[PDB]
Every structure is written in structure tokens, then in C-alpha cells.
Design a protein around this ligand. Structure first.
Ligand code: H3G
Length: 186
């Protein structure tokens, strides 16, 4: 099946806990995969303009590890619940992808999660201004704008609204699309 095929592909890239004990300032993100209309999509947030890190930017759900978290996956899940209402029974964490090093002292660990078909986002306005889906296949043929560095523009066909996706977020989206969609029969 589509979903069993996705998980099987993702598991080949799982690094597990190999980099998780190193002495960094630690953040996690959740890359949430949603199946709609026979195709895979990624779920993105627009961050509230009020926040410390990355105000008004497109990002994946996530945040800083706290002492309550059992591990790095727990950080991702706690933050996704606070931002968009995703509950534990509504997500299966499939793997941990390569971490992202920034600012000399910070390590961001990305987890890929399969999202239940009855989940409906409830944006928390203190953290998130918007929540939106993008088909995973978009990231194979994106609409690129040079700002010099590369930005993606995605227009939602439901309503005509355009979103800009860039930086670590754009990079991780391309990675997941390559892992799941490369070399597939039609
Ligand atoms: C979505 C999530 C909250 C996980 C990101 C963490 C990293 N970000 C920073 O801006 C950053 C940069 C240097 C040090 C600390 C944070 C962007 C946002």
C-alpha cells in the first residue's frame, strides 16, 4: 500500500538515537505526513508574529526540549499538541532523519510522523497564525524565486493564497519527497 511503502522507505534513513546525547541546545521538529485524495501531503504552520524564534515564517511544528520530555521524539509531539492540537494516538513516529546543526551550539532533530485520517487541525493563535497542507510531489518541481538564496512559492488551489517556504524547512521537505517518491512505477 501507499502508506506501508512510505514507512518502508523512511526506515532506511533512520539514524535513531546516534546523535541524541551530544551536549547541544536541543530542539525537535515533527514532519507530519497526511494522506488525502490518494496522495501524500506535508503539514506546515505559519508562526505567530509575537514569537521569539522565526516570527511569521513557515515552519514545521516543533520547539525546545524541556525537562519533562523522555526523549527528542517526545519534544516534537508535545510541541505539535500545543500548536495544532495533535494528540498522541493520532500520530505514529516512523523515524528520525539527519539532524540540522546551527549557530555553533544548537542541534535540531527532525522526526517523520504518519497522521491519522480523522485529525483536524485546531490552530492555537498564541503560537500559530495558520496551518496548511502541501502535496509532497510539489517538492520535486517547486516554483523557485531567488531572493542570493532559493525560496519556494506554493499557491493553494482551494483559495489562491500563496505561501513562501525557505531555509531548513524547505530543505527538509525536499529530502522527505526524495526519500518517498524517487524511483516509483506509475
Ligand atoms: C521550529 C523551531 C522552533 C524548532 C526552530 C528552532 C531553530 N530556529 C531558530 O531561530 C534558532 C536559531 C539559533 C538558535 C536557536 C534557535 C528556528 C525555529
Amino acid at each position: 500500500s501507499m502508506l506501508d511503502d512510505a514507512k518502508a522507505r523512511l526506515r532506511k534513513y533512520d539514524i535513531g538515537g546516534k546523535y541524541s546525547h551530544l551536549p547541544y541546545n536541543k530542539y525537535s521538529v515533527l514532519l507530519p505526513l497526511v494522506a488525502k485524495e490518494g496522495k501524500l501531503h506535508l503539514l506546515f504552520t505559519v508562526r505567530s508574529e509575537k514569537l521569539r524564534r522565526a516570527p511569521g515564517e513557515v515552519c514545521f511544528p516543533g520547539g525546545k526540549r524541556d525537562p519533562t520530555d523522555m526523549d527528542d521524539a517526545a519534544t516534537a509531539l508535545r510541541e505539535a499538541q500545543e500548536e495544532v492540537g495533535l494528540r498522541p494516538h493520532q500520530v505514529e513516529v516512523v523515524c528520525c532523519l539527519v539532524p540540522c546543526l546551527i549557530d555553533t551550539d544548537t542541534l535540531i532533530t527532525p522526526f517523520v510522523g504518519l497522521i491519522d485520517h480523522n485529525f483536524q487541525a485546531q490552530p492555537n493563535p498564541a503560537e500559530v497564525k495558520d496551518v496548511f497542507l502541501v502535496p509532497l510531489a510539489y517538492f520535486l518541481h517547486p516554483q523557485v524565486h531567488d531572493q542570493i538564496n532559493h525560496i519556494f512559492e506554493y499557491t493553494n488551489p482551494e483559495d489562491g493564497v500563496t505561501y513562501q517556504i525557505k531555509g531548513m524547512t524547505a530543505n527538509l521537505a525536499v529530502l522527505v519527497a526524495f526519500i518517498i517518491l524517487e524511483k516509483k512505477p506509475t
